[PDB]
Amino acid sequence: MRPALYFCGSIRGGREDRTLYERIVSRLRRFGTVLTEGDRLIHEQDLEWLQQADVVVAEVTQPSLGVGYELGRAVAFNKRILCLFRPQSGRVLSAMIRGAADGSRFQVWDYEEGEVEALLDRYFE
Amino acid sequence: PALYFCGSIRREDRTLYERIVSRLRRFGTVLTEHVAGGDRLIHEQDLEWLQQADVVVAEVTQPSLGVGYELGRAVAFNKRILCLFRPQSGRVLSAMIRGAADGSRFQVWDYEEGEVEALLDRYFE
Ligand SMILES: O=C(O)c1ccc2c(c1)CN(Cc1csc(N3C[C@@H]4C[C@@H](CN(c5ccccc5)C4)C3)n1)CC2
Ligand SMILES: O=C(O)c1ccc2c(c1)CN(Cc1csc(N3C[C@@H]4C[C@@H](CN(c5ccccc5)C4)C3)n1)CC2
Ligand SMILES: [Cl-]
């Protein structure tokens, strides 16, 4: 059985954010199966993918109620979670996400655009 | 009835949060106005307020990982939730929040700034 990996990022992410999302998702395929590969239907199916994940990887650089909501549901589902944040964006990460980290099943890793594949190789090995 | 309020930590939204809290005081104790690193302290205090609440009121106009996270945790705790969104902002509310609504235990209400007080009366009576 392959590990089930759930990726989440903002639907409002820009061109830079979306290039990094594709780079994270491409690298995730090496370590397991990426589950993703009206509004009520999106909510229900997203929660079903999330419930079936072994690991949740969230890119939390861009503020998002949807990503935050997925992280809150993921914690209550007892999921192992890795949050990836780019301090080069000029933003400060929400105290709720940074404060949810416990250094083990909820980690928040700051990163520079260039090292994302190397940080993902390290986390998943 | 113990009431929990949340809004984005990131002007016109900040004065609205004060009016919302003042109006909620008329219906019950607002837990969120009464009082490991700093982020973890904010997370833990916020979760203590959230677990003690009977009703969760969230201002969801500004995209926020923190507000979304609180809403995710609130749903999992089976809390009664009211989300307030201002369509005048020009934003499209996240599908995760709009899709979480069931018209009963979780409701999302579009409102106009001047009429927020009336909407809270209609909900709490
Ligand atoms: O920001 C919001 O308010 C929001 C609202 C709804 C959802 C999310 C975020 C994220 N959820 C998890 C998820 C799965 S794949 C993924 N990304 C991130 C970006 C780009 C691309 C496709 N995404 C997507 C996929 C399906 C439905 C909607 C958006 C959005 C890859 N994110 C899905 C539902
Ligand atoms: O958007 C974020 O990433 C974010 C990060 C952290 C928290 C929130 C949001 C919201 N939580 C709920 C809460 C309680 S009183 C409240 N509001 C909303 C605004 C203005 C004012 C003071 N707030 C506040 C109060 C205590 C601690 C921190 C911020 C923030 C009144 N919101 C608290 C923690
Ligand atoms: Cl946690």
Q: CATH number of the domain that A115 lies in?
A: 3.40.50.450
Answer positive or negative: Cα dihedral of B111, B97, A100, A98: negative
- The structure tokens listed for B51 are 């677990």
Q: What is the resolution of this structure in A?
A: 1.8
- How many domains would you assign to chain B? 1
Q: Tokens 């113990």 belong to which residue?
A: B2
- What whole-number distance in Å separates Cα of residue B71 and Cα of residue B75? 6
- Specify the pairing of strand B29-30 against strand B55-59: unpaired
- The chain B residue lying nearest A47, using CA atoms, is B96
- The structure tokens listed for A33 are 């199966």
- What whole-number distance in Å separates Cα of residue A30 and Cα of residue A26? 8
- What whole-number distance in Å separates Cα of residue B54 and Cα of residue B1? 6
Q: Using an 8 Å Cβ cutoff, are B49 and B32 in contact?
A: yes
Per-position DSSP letters for B82-99, written without gaps between them? EEEE-GGG-----HHHHT
Q: Tokens 């890795």 belong to which residue?
A: A82
- The structure tokens listed for B105 are 């235990």
Size of interface A-B (CB pairs under 8 A): 132
Helix (H, G, I), strand (E, B) or coil at A91: coil
Residues 6+ apart with CB under 8 A from B6: B32, B56, B57, B58, B59, B66, B67, B70, B71
Q: Using an 8 Å Cβ cutoff, are B30 and B5 in contact?
A: yes
Check residue A125 and report its DSSP letter. Answer: -
Distance (Å) from the alpha carbon of B64 to chain A's nearest alpha carbon: 5
Residue A67 near ligand 1, beta carbon < 6 Å: yes
Q: Give the Cβ contact number of residue A52 at 10 Å.
A: 12
Cα torsion through A5, A11, A17, A19, rounded to 10: 70
Q: Which residues of B touch A97 (CB under 8 A)?
A: 65-66, 69
Range of the structural domain that residue B101 is part of: 2-123
Q: Tokens 């982020």 belong to which residue?
A: B39
